[PDB]
Design a protein around this nucleic acid. Structure first.
Lengths: 37, 138, 205, 167
RNA sequence: CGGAAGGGAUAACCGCUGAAAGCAUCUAAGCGGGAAGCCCGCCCCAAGAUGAGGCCUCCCACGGCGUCAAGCCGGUAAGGAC
RNA sequence: GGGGAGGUUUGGCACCUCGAUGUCGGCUCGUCGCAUCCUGGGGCUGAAGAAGGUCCCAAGGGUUGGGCUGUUCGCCCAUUAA
RNA sequence: CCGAGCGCGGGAACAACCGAGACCGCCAGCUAAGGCCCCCAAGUCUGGGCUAAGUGGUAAAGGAUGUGGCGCCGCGAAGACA
């Protein structure tokens, strides 16, 4: 993952948080660290 | 008959606030006055529209994200000579500029169209050169 | 940030320390301080500085023998040190002690209209194989159809002489009040015996 | 809000406490009043931005009060090995994985205080600028570095394979 | 010898107090860090910056037509030039 | 297996130009673009560290010398943070 | 439709998109298209809905706890969401 147009909530422990304008998908493991870009 | 043409009238001066005001909207009014469109005997090729001393332009209001968004640009004939400045920095350093830029573009382009720009003095104060009359407006 | 005026002389390499040092010398000498300049009636903080005395009939009129302290003008007239508020009297040389580094401004000598190689610097080329026609020549300038113009300031042949420069970070290891001299790391722009101001350097302040 | 000292100003509710005062200015929107003895706050309407402001702000000042009512509970647990935290005079001279001693200085409005070298204590009299300095030191020497070693609030370290996982 | 050192605002991103949505959040209110990059700090030009600015001084009336209105003409003062 | 973008390659069209629009590369001179080779920074890592793999921001300045081929291409040699 | 209407007004500028067939004059009036804060002529008219990106001010499959409104099905004062 990490930066891609298709951001998922994958392992349910991840959230969509529209921070600083654009979408990220935060969790515990920074391996799930998507982003709407 | 034959339409009447004004004699050499005496230019009337005027004073305007600024602060709390909207940039465009403000100038919007300024211009129509730099010319005789407010006066009943407006004439195209003459220049008889009131002089306009504007005070504390350092505190003009601007909507949206202009403050951070709006970007003015200047181009020196030089390669990569494009220089663009944000409305944010225009206030800090010599802000009386913003109001002027805003108006200049809102006046004719011809010779007198700059001649009327001269009729406008703007100060980041208030305070002006208390030359004469200068009836404050709203 | 202080300063002193000066005229150029000397250049050698004096075996100071044990190593060799290219020694540019300058006569700061009796260089007057005649008038300051304060914020409201000026807009900064500067001082006017004269030089070498020979001035009688050929000068006259306002002098600034007026000013408020006469002293007559030099002959090499006066210049201006910003951010410098002295003590009063005409300042000599010892303003700078040996062991400090400094900035220095002065006119460069004149090489006039030169050939682009010896100007900015291009290349030329075809001394043989090609043609003899374009030896010391710029070759090309702009692009074909668009822009279709000649770039603003795209380096071109012309003048490269009667100018002026300020050099930074030179090092003075001597100064003789006894005849008013200043012995620095040799790098001195301009010819031997002309206009040159010294000011304090800049590094981290 | 018992022995407090709130103060309604236009959009800047100033409040004194047993330690010092704090000004906490917020948007005039909604209504900022000291009534009966305890402080209240109420949205102008059911408008998204407004609702948000109402909650956010009401709690902001709610802490602002309890901030001068001493809200300091913030201290860093430095774990690892050769990591000593000293406090000479005013400055704190801790010595982490860095090749040099770490030198911090208690600024205006808050105080640190280092009991023993294994754990720094910080009496913070400003809940906002407080966690900022907690994070200052935590991010001065970040912990957990694969296996361990660093500066922990107390946040249970997540591991990752040590002398392995690098082919 | 020059790059600099330092200042200011920031990206990506890293953070603090904190809601709406009793928990959570690096944010929608607010504050911090954070780039050879942006503005400056440096060198040079440069007031035809038609807006021709500022400073230090220096010289000065009626001499003949314009009485009242701006010119115009001949030598001079600081001087400038050949 | 779907959707887009870019206008460098390779083409489909035949509107400026058949009373003229001199087609390859190299010398010289560049300038801009960023989907960045290098140099900053950061997030991820099947990342101990070392070094690497990948993505995101970032053109400031830099992008070397020769063998061969007319050859841009490319292969090679000696190197380079590149 | 132009060409033959490079005559006219819109279309920022444009033979043929929209309006509309110029005998000639006029310092007269309705109006088309298009328009009315200012260029440039006329409402910063009236009234009420939406949006926070400068979207407006030129892009899709596709992606989302963006904001407004609407519909469905449990849970809940027997006491729920958290």
């Amino acid at each position: 993952m990490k930066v891609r147009a298709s951001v998922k909530r994958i392992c349910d422990k991840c959230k969509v948080i529209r921070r600083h304008g654009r979408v990220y998908v935060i969790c515990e493991n920074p391996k799930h660290k998507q982003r709407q870009g | 008959m034959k339409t009447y043409v004004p004699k050499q009238v005496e230019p009337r001066w005027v004073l305007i606030d600024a602060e709390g005001k909207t940039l465009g909207r403000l100038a919007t009014k300024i211009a129509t006055l730099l010319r005789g469109k407010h006066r009943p005997d407006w004439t195209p090729n003459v220049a008889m529209g009131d002089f306009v001393v504007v005070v504390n332009a350092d505190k003009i209001r601007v909507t949206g994200k202009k403050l951070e968004q709006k970007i003015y640009t200047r181009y020196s004939g030089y390669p990569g000579g494009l220089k663009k400045i944000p409305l944010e920095k225009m206030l800090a350093t010599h802000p009386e500029r913003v109001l002027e830029h805003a108006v200049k573009g809102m006046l004719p382009k011809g010779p007198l169209g700059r001649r009327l720009f001269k009729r406008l003095k703007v100060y980041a104060g208030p305070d002006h050169p208390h030359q004469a009359q200068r009836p404050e407006k709203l | 940030m202080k300063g002193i005026l000066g005229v150029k002389v000397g250049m050698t390499r004096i075996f100071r320390d044990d190593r060799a040092v290219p020694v540019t010398v300058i006569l700061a000498g009796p260089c007057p301080v005649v008038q300051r300049r304060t914020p409201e009636k000026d807009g900064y903080t500067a001082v006017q500085l004269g030089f070498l005395p020979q001035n009688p009939k050929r000068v006259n009129r306002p002098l600034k023998g007026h000013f408020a302290k006469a002293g007559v003008e030099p002959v090499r007239i006066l210049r201006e040190i910003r951010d410098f508020n002295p003590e009063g009297d005409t300042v000599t040389v010892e303003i700078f002690k040996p062991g400090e580094r400094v900035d220095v401004t002065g006119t460069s000598k004149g090489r006039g209209f030169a050939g682009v190689m010896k100007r900015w610097n291009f290349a030329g080329g075809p001394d043989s194989h090609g043609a003899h026609k374009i030896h010391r020549h710029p070759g090309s300038i702009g692009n074909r159809k668009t822009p279709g113009r000649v770039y603003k300031g795209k380096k071109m042949a012309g003048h490269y002489g009667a100018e002026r420069v300020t050099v930074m970070n030179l090092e003075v290891v001597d100064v003789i009040p006894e005849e008013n001299l200043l012995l620095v790391k040799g790098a001195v722009p301009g010819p031997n015996g002309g206009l040159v101001i010294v000011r304090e350097t800049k590094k981290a302040a | 809000p018992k022995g407090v000292s709130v103060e309604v100003a236009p959009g800047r509710v100033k409040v004194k406490g047993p330690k010092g005062e704090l000004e906490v200015p917020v948007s005039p929107e909604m209504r900022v009043v000291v009534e009966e003895g305890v402080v209240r706050v109420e949205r102008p309407s059911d408008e998204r931005r407004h609702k948000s402001l109402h909650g956010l702000t009401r709690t902001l000042i709610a802490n602002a009060v309890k901030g001068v009512s001493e809200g300091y509970s913030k201290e860093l647990l430095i774990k690892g090995i050769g990591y000593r935290a000293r406090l000479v005079g005013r400055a704190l001279e801790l010595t982490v994985g860095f090749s040099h001693p770490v030198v911090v200085e208690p600024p205006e409005g808050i105080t640190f205080e280092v009991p023993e070298p294994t754990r720094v204590r910080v009496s913070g009299i400003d809940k906002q600028k407080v966690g900022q300095v907690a994070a200052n030191i935590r991010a001065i020497r970040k912990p957990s570095a694969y296996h361990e070693k660093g500066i922990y609030y107390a946040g249970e370290p997540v591991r990752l394979k040590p002398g392995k996982a690098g082919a």
